[PDB]
RNA sequence: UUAUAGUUUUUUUA
RNA sequence: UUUUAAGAACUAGAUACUAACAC
RNA sequence: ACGAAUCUCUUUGCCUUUUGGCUUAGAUCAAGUGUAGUAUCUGUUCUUUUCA
RNA sequence: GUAUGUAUUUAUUUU
């Protein structure tokens, strides 16, 4: 059936990210240079990250032992390896297969990928390197937060404090309302589409590295006998498959906000806000949208409404979905706990 | 030495046998008698049966779109 | 006439077999062609 | 530890695949030493398996190539199948196509090992039977020439 | 003609099934069309 | 071309042993009742002790010549073809059945 | 290492 | 009527399979 | 001349010792140690015949 | 560490 997006949508999306960035005035990443000031540190980190998988183990299987070898040398010969990698990214486009085995919850299931050790070691270096250079250059604005500074329950907390202590929501004097959305993105990665990627990454990262990614996805997938090329969606077990993921969702976000309201949340790049901040109350009140927070999948939003605007919406909706039934309260859903 | 069977045991080979006399359980008399019948909102980027088959089905693809997840 | 079984998995007597008894049509959809070249157009506009 | 491929072990492989079939690899790395499942099957599917296409270009394959690989920024195994050509080779002959732009001992002992292994198909039970039966026949022969030598004494001892 | 032809066609049966597990599109190069129908029929049945 | 029905074949063999029988009789010219029992339902036929023995001997020699065609066929057939891999005898046998295929 | 030891999924820290 | 093994002596051990036998 | 028969060989037909199940591919697939029984891998040196 | 399997003829069967 061919590509789904249609070229129309494609162009619109790309342009979006563009005027964001130029407007955001962001400098793209260079490939890790041969002379790098920080470099072996970063590699310290990534390798400890692999090490930690095996910290606990006692029985080590074959691929494992292969690993610990590859590690131990990597400790020994940092300039060796760094050269080996920067080579690998500059060049190699084709990769060993990959292995899914699903692991059980006794209720649901989840895919567990396994990459292959060299590919891993490179990756982990590059994962680490991305996050560091990005957050160094303040790629992501506040409101994308499964982030550093806040462990999850604390995130809940400051999210409440956000809700409340912003100005005025509790004055019901007139009809005044405020409404939260709780959402998923459904499939999110599994529609991530390469040809789109390799461009959107031509934005923010050198054409090579990005190439290393887009060409880093497609693999055979061997589950035992069953095997198939992976032509389309996204394998998350790739060490860096976090980052781009966040990236892609940002694109979603600059839609749901649309430019301006985002420019509220970020403020200037010179003065990116903390989580919950603005300049005047009006900055909140220049728009109905007050909080927007997107955590992995789930999107969480807060609208502040007065009967004017809100009844102009229900003017739209109602106009197109009249229900003399008055049954629109049937399928509607809220909590079974409370 | 695993062989797929090609056959089944004729009742006759049984039939010639003499009886046993063991009494099993489920044969104890029961049901002993029968029965008979008689403004702002413009900001964002967008200006305004049963299919006999399985792994292409609608349900099944929902299901596996939940659980294996 | 029924062919004879050569089965990738079991080989229950050990018999050996010439490989090929053990062992695409379409192209892409031009939706691609349009996709990458449209991405391309907006691209070069933007960089300009 | 870092290895490369002798046509010795390569041949032992293609013999092994030519018996056990593809998807039993964990056996194919038994005969083959020095090597693993994923290693074996990696080189097999990516290189050795004859059903692959090894040949030159053509302008079908070429204009085809720059077509597809220009449309899809890098996805090689997809484009590979699109060419019905092996992965890294399409990659390679591609890069060349833009490079016109410019400005015997213990291996003989392992072969003794596998070459000896293939030739016994049964499993422990059947061999065990071969023995047991022959032992029965020795019993017969013995008991016979027992009776024969007893007939040469004329005393006739009946068989059980 | 039965015995050998039969059993061996069953070997085609199994081979067909454990194809359909592994997703093997299972085209045996040539083979009588109706029999191949039977195989498809049953393997649907066992499939569900 | 081709396969012969098990009918017409049995007829043809009937012809072959016709003409062979004819070389028996005629060649025997070249080199040169039914009783029933009223007592019991048994019937009694009288035949020459001749031509019964020609019969049996003919049969035996047929079994011979066929047996030997099959045997010499063993020898030649198993010595000739040298191509495909063979683990044991039955690989040669069966594998040559897969050659019989196409 | 003992009074055993094929099925009883064999093996991880705060 | 069948048949014909190159023959003899000297040599070390490497890779081996396994062992209700020794932490 | 050709009719008939025996043997020999080639071709075709018929396949003759010619793959006999299922379940999660049934699951799993390497890191040890001394000695000992038994299998077998190579070198060197010498000599090419018959009768009671 | 074991199931499992095998043989255990002594007391003379007529020439």
Curated annotation (Swiss-Prot), chain C:
This is Pre-mRNA-processing protein 45. Involved in pre-mRNA splicing. Associated with the spliceosome throughout the splicing reactions, until after the second catalytic step. It comes from Saccharomyces cerevisiae (strain ATCC 204508 / S288c) (Baker's yeast). Belongs to the CWC complex (or CEF1-associated complex), a spliceosome sub-complex reminiscent of a late-stage spliceosome composed of the U2, U5 and U6 snRNAs and at least BUD13, BUD31, BRR2, CDC40, CEF1, CLF1, CUS1, CWC2, CWC15, CWC21, CWC22, CWC23, CWC24, CWC25, CWC27, ECM2, HSH155, IST3, ISY1, LEA1, MSL1, NTC20, PRP8, PRP9, PRP11, PRP19, PRP21, PRP22, PRP45, PRP46, SLU7, SMB1, SMD1, SMD2, SMD3, SMX2, SMX3, SNT309, SNU114, SPP2, SYF1, SYF2, RSE1 and YJU2. Interacts with CLF1, PRP22 and PRP46. Interacts with SPP382. It is found in: Nucleus. Present with 1670 molecules/cell in log phase SD medium. Belongs to the SNW family. The chain holds residues 164 to 217 of 379 of the full protein.
Swiss-Prot record, chain D:
It is found in: Cytoplasm; Nucleus. It comes from the Eukaryota. Residues 1-52, 55-102 form the HTH myb-type domain. Residues 25-48, 76-98 bind DNA. Signal peptide: none annotated. Changing residue 94 to G: No effect. Slower growth and thermosensitivity. Complete loss of function. Involved in pre-mRNA splicing and cell cycle control. Required for the binding of the NTC complex (or PRP19-associated complex) components to the spliceosome to mediate conformational rearrangement or to stabilize the structure of the spliceosome after U4 snRNA dissociation, which leads to spliceosome maturation. Its absence leads to an arrest of the cell cycle, possibly due to the inefficient splicing of TUB1. Belongs to the CEF1 family. Belongs to the NTC complex (or PRP19-associated complex), composed of at least CEF1, CLF1, ISY1, NTC20, SNT309, SYF1, SYF2, and PRP19. Present with 784 molecules/cell in log phase SD medium. This is Pre-mRNA-splicing factor CEF1. It comes from Saccharomyces cerevisiae (strain ATCC 204508 / S288c) (Baker's yeast). The chain holds residues 9 to 201 of 590 of the full protein.
Curated annotation (Swiss-Prot), chain E:
Signal peptide: none annotated. Coiled coil: none annotated. It is found in: Nucleus. The MPN (JAB/Mov34) domain has structural similarity with deubiquitinating enzymes, but lacks the residues that would bind the catalytic metal ion. Contains a region with structural similarity to reverse transcriptase, presenting the classical thumb, fingers and palm architecture, but lacks enzyme activity, since the essential metal-binding residues are not conserved. Present with 468 molecules/cell in log phase SD medium. Component of the U4/U6-U5 tri-snRNP complex composed of the U4, U6 and U5 snRNAs and at least PRP3, PRP4, PRP6, PRP8, PRP18, PRP31, PRP38, SNU13, SNU23, SNU66, SNU114, SPP381, SMB1, SMD1, SMD2, SMD3, SMX2, SMX3, LSM2, LSM3, LSM4, LSM5, LSM6, LSM7, LSM8, BRR2 and DIB1. This is Pre-mRNA-splicing factor 8. The lineage of its organism: Eukaryota, Fungi, Dikarya, Ascomycota, Saccharomycotina.
From Swiss-Prot, chain F:
One of its GO terms (biological process) is mRNA splicing, via spliceosome. The keyword Cell membrane does not apply. Its main location: nucleus. Residues 20-32 have a biased composition (Polar residues). Keywords: mRNA processing, mRNA splicing, Nucleus, Phosphoprotein, Spliceosome. One of its GO terms (cellular component) is U2-type prespliceosome. It is found in: Nucleus. Present with 1670 molecules/cell in log phase SD medium. Belongs to the SYF2 family. Belongs to the NTC complex (or PRP19-associated complex), composed of at least CEF1, CLF1, ISY1, NTC20, SNT309, SYF1, SYF2, and PRP19. Involved in pre-mRNA splicing and cell cycle control. As a component of the NTC complex (or PRP19-associated complex), associates to the spliceosome to mediate conformational rearrangement or to stabilize the structure of the spliceosome after U4 snRNA dissociation, which leads to spliceosome maturation. The cell cycle arrest of SYF2 defective cells may be due to the inefficient splicing of TUB1. This is Pre-mRNA-splicing factor SYF2.
